[PDB]
Write a protein that binds this DNA or RNA. Structure first.
Ligand SMILES: Nc1nc(=O)n([C@@H]2CS[C@H](COP(=O)(O)OP(=O)(O)OP(=O)(O)O)O2)cc1F
Lengths: 548, 398
DNA sequence: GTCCCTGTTCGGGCGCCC
DNA sequence: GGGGGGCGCCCGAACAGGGACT
């Protein structure tokens, strides 16, 4: 039936008018599915025959559902969607089984033909004109294909349930579209009585709940999961086995893996992900790199294993544990009692041209924190592979505000560390290098070199380069020709800002070579001086590399 | 009471900022507060055909069992169609009262209401968001004090006449009250005003430090010392054109070991004397201009020390100061840093009756993850995040 | 001014849900 | 097979802001 709920007032965008677009051809089978559905909707007042008083039109079609027997009628409203006003989406995210608490009685219910039970504003009905080829109808209810439909339904549903929620604050109703998870701490007879009350409430507002879709016994099928009473599980994940992979193939495998990582610990997709670079189209084919090759294999082995998650006990604590995976990849498991994960995940986001492990760890902690707050509404305690002293050093010598919430060290390598440590004071008995670089904007030609206090001077010439690059080149050069202990003096704010942040990884081949050298050295000390101010021997090296 | 029509700036649409995730604590407080406000006509449930939105959260005050709802109207305020007392910056004591309650007594122009929508989230997305709209003058909207000014002036009217050398200033939801009364009589005065305000329905400005730049004193100078020195002065000379560097730079003639000690010539020893003084004299020629924003810059100096400079045009510092704190274990940079921007916002309101735009030395995600856990003010400054060149770090060092 | 380099947003694919 | 809203993940395009240089 149609809800007697108030319609939600909608309008087109200003100066815009409804859509005129020719129906396209349809399969015979689809045409029959269509009029079986329409002759029935029309009969129930969900749609009305229109005449020549309606200029507009929009193409319709259909697709089989998950029950494979029933058809879902759809409307390619892409055009009317463009000319329909903005809504504020009310759905703020996706509920997660690991955020559910142990319940004594559980029920799952679908609403029957949900959209077609919510009336559509009268002034707007005309813009939904469609045509069934073999009859011209228009929608009186919400149509599947329009951009107003999800939020209008989600809000409508929330109105309808407020009364029951307020009357019954200790029944918990997870509400995702027309899907309802209902949980209570009542005995099965009392619970079932409450479910009937909920079904009648819903039916008073025109929303039927078919028994066919009413789950009474575990395990429950919910949001892609199976809820058993003490544990939950994700419905099986199947990975493609192409031997030739396209961009789309790849993109389709990284998704299923991401999906998998919420409960499958140790998943990685760096090497797969790299393939996706430069590829100008979904259909492009790409050969797996040797390391991508190997990676996919590791994940395939992971999926074979049997795994579940548990529900949430608020009396206990939330603990998050982080594992370093290499190459800017991290895995985490969130739990309350050891070896009983609530859930898991990964962090593999490369942010920054240059960075190091302690930074990324800080970024992993922040992501996990934000996610725990969405799912459980509180921060977890951390276990991290980083010694208190390492973190203390980094915090001490980093010119930025940084911080991690309450955490305890876990010696599960590979541990997170600082791979080198610049000195705070200049080094006694270490050769002092004054480095510099210059480049010609037009020719792209340049020079990098040094001068040392012991009389050494070297100048190297370059091509297709830049100022920044030649400043970084000069530094690399001084590391290459210096001993195990070196003082380096530069006038490059650019170069000094990178190196002082103690990176161990970079996009830049050159910064990587520099990092290698910094790791080998026993002591390095980097000082800055303002350029072009006659400060020897910055002055001396300036003259050298300035033959351009 | 008939409403005061209000408009947006021209060619501007209403705010559309996504709500961020809240803790359980905060959501329960907001659900609790909102249902009451709804029970009193102050806010109404709305649908999603209202396309606008503005974030919301909540703070638990000091030692208390009371939460304060706090809507982030920074965007709205930026898009809303648009006399501070010099005397307030000079008072032994200044007390800050929260008069936000007062606004709920004034209806809100019906056409404007839609631009004040907000959304309450649920734990683990058990439900879609619950959207509300305002029916009165919302706290945190810069429109609220404006429209309520006239009624405000009547209220404080005779408290002022009766106490003509207590100065009362209003900024947004806030009332600033300064006096030279010894604490106790200032306290008894403040409560007098509060009594006076229930009938209708602490700081110390004078003792705020200025943070001079300063130069090392040494018996032995090495090449490295002098190079650091010269570079610091080369930059300081953008602020203080008086600064001179030539005689010191002459000691760095040649190409020498960083740890070689160098005896200061008497000239270079001299200009060291000058520069030391050219730093004492105040920054000449910097005029506060309200057509432009106050920019605040903050630097982490370590050991819980923080430095900052308020300016409108680069190198033209209106003020430069310092924030010190605890030295130990539980030190939390993010908490110290939000305390810093709150002390600095506070000083700006008091001195120029305006809010600074902060340039913050923190990662954006690190800050947005945690600042609402240390926030205690009814307003919220504008900010932007900025990884600061490790050079300026040493310029303002103490 | 321009060029260079770095950081943000934002839209485009895919994953999952209904 | 062609539609919609939400979140997630990656990527590249656009554009912003600071430094170095003519
Ligand atoms: N792919 C989908 N597009 C949609 O627009 N919908 C919308 C949003 S939820 C609403 C109804 O979902 P259901 O899958 O329960 O389908 P239904 O209510 O149309 O019919 P029924 O519940 O099977 O009786 O249809 C669902 C889809 F799966």
């Amino acid at each position: 039936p149609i809800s007697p709920i108030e319609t939600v007032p909608v309008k087109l965008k200003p100066g815009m008018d409804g859509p005129k677009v020719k129906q396209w051809p349809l399969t015979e089978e689809k045409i029959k599915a269509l009029v079986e559905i329409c002759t029935e909707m029309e009969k129930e007042g969900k749609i009305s025959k229109i005449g020549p008083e309606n200029p507009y039109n929009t193409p319709v079609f259909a697709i089989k559902k998950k029950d494979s027997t029933k058809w879902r009628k759809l409307v390619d409203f892409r055009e009317l969607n463009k000319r329909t006003q903005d809504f504020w989406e009310v759905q703020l995210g996706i509920p997660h089984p690991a955020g559910l608490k142990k319940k004594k009685s559980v029920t799952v219910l679908d609403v029957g033909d949900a959209y077609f039970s919510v009336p559509l504003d009268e002034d707007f009905r005309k813009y939904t004109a469609f045509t069934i080829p073999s009859i011209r109808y228009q929608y009186n209810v919400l149509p599947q294909g329009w951009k107003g439909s999800p939020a209008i339904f989600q809000s409508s549903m929330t109105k309808i349930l407020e009364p029951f929620r307020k009357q019954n604050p200790d029944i918990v109703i997870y509400q995702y579209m027309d899907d309802l998870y209902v949980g209570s701490d009542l005995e099965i007879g009392q619970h079932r009585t409450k479910i009937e009350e909920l079904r009648q409430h819903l039916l008073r507002w025109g929303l039927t709940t078919p028994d066919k879709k009413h789950q009474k016994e575990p395990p429950f099928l919910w949001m892609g999961y199976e809820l058993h009473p003490d544990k939950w599980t994700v419905q099986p994940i199947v990975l493609p086995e192409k031997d030739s992979w396209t961009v789309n193939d790849i993109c389709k495998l990284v998704g299923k893996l991401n999906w998998a990582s919420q409960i499958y610990p140790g998943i990685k997709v760096r090497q797969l992900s790299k393939l996706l670079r430069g590829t100008k189209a979904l259909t492009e084919v790409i050969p797996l790199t040797e390391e991508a090759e190997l990676e996919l294999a590791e994940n395939r082995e992971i999926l074979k294993e049997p795994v579940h998650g548990v529900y949430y006990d608020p009396s206990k604590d939330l603990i998050a544990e982080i594992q370093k995976q290499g190459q800017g990849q991290w895995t985490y498991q969130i739990y309350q009692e050891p070896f009983k994960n609530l859930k898991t995940g990964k962090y593999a986001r490369m942010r920054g041209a240059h960075t190091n492990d302690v930074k990324q760890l800080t970024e992993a902690v922040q992501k996990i924190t934000t996610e725990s707050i969405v799912i459980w509404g509180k921060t977890p305690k951390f276990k991290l592979p980083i010694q208190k002293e390492t973190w203390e050093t980094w915090w001490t010598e980093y010119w930025q505000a940084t911080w991690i919430p309450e955490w305890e060290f876990v010696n599960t390598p590979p541990l997170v560390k600082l791979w080198y440590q610049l000195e705070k004071e200049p080094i006694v008995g270490a050769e002092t290098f004054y480095v510099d670089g210059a480049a010609n904007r037009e020719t792209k030609l340049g020079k990098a070199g040094y001068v040392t206090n012991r009389g050494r001077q070297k100048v190297v010439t370059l091509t297709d380069t830049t100022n920044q690059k030649t400043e970084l080149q000069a530094i690399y050069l001084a590391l290459q020709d210096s001993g195990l202990e070196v003082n380096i003096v530069t006038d490059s704010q650019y170069a000094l800002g990178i190196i002082q942040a103690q990176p161990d990884q970079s996009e830049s081949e050159l910064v990587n070579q520099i990092i290698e050298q910094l790791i080998k050295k026993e002591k390095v000390y980097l000082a800055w001086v303002p350029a072009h101010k006659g400060i020897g021997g910055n002055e001396q090296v300036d003259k050298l590399v300035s033959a351009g | 009471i008939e409403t005061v029509p209000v408009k947006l700036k021209p060619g501007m649409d209403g705010p559309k900022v996504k709500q961020w995730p809240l803790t359980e604590e905060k959501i329960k407080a907001l659900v609790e507060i909102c249902t009451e406000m709804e029970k009193e006509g102050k806010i109404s449930k709305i649908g999603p055909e209202n396309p606008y939105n503005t974030p919301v959260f909540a703070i638990k005050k000091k030692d208390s069992t009371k939460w304060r709802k706090l809507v982030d109207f920074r965007e709205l305020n930026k898009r809303t169609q648009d006399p501070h007392p010099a005397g307030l910056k000079k008072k032994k004591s200044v007390t800050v009262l929260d008069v936000g309650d007062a606004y709920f007594s004034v209806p809100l122009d019906e056409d404007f209401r839609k631009y004040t929508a907000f959304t309450i989230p649920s734990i683990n997305n058990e439900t879609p968001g619950i959207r509300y709209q305002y029916n009165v003058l919302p706290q945190g909207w810069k429109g609220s004090p404006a429209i309520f000014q006239s009624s405000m002036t009547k209220i404080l009217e005779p408290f002022r006449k009766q106490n003509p050398d207590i100065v009362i200033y209003q900024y947004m939801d806030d009332l600033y009250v300064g006096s030279d009364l010894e604490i106790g009589q200032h306290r008894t005065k403040i409560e007098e005003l509060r009594q006076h305000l229930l009938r209708w329905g602490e700081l110390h400005p004078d003792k705020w430090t200025v943070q001079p730049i300063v130069l090392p004193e040494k018996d032995s100078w090495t090449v490295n010392d002098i190079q650091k020195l010269v570079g610091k002065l080369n930059w300081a000379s953008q602020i203080y054109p008086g600064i001179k560097v030539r005689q010191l730079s002459k000691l760095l003639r040649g190409t020498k070991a960083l740890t070689e000690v160098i005896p200061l010539t008497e000239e270079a020893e001299l200009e060291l004397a000058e520069n030391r003084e050219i730093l004492k004299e105040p920054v000449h020629g910097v005029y506060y201009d309200p057509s432009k924003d106050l920019i605040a810059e903050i630097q982490k100096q370590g050991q819980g020390q923080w430095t900052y400079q308020i300016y409108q045009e680069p190198f033209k510092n209106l003020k430069t100061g310092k924030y010190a704190r605890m030295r130990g274990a539980h030190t939390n940079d993010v908490k110290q840093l939000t305390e810093a921007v709150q002390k600095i916002t506070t000083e700006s309101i008091v001195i120029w009756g305006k809010t600074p735009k902060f340039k913050l030395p923190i990662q954006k995600e690190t800050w947005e993850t945690w600042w609402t856990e240390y926030w205690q003010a009814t307003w919220i400054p504008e900010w932007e995040f900025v990884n600061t060149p490790p050079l300026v770090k040493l310029w303002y060092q103490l």
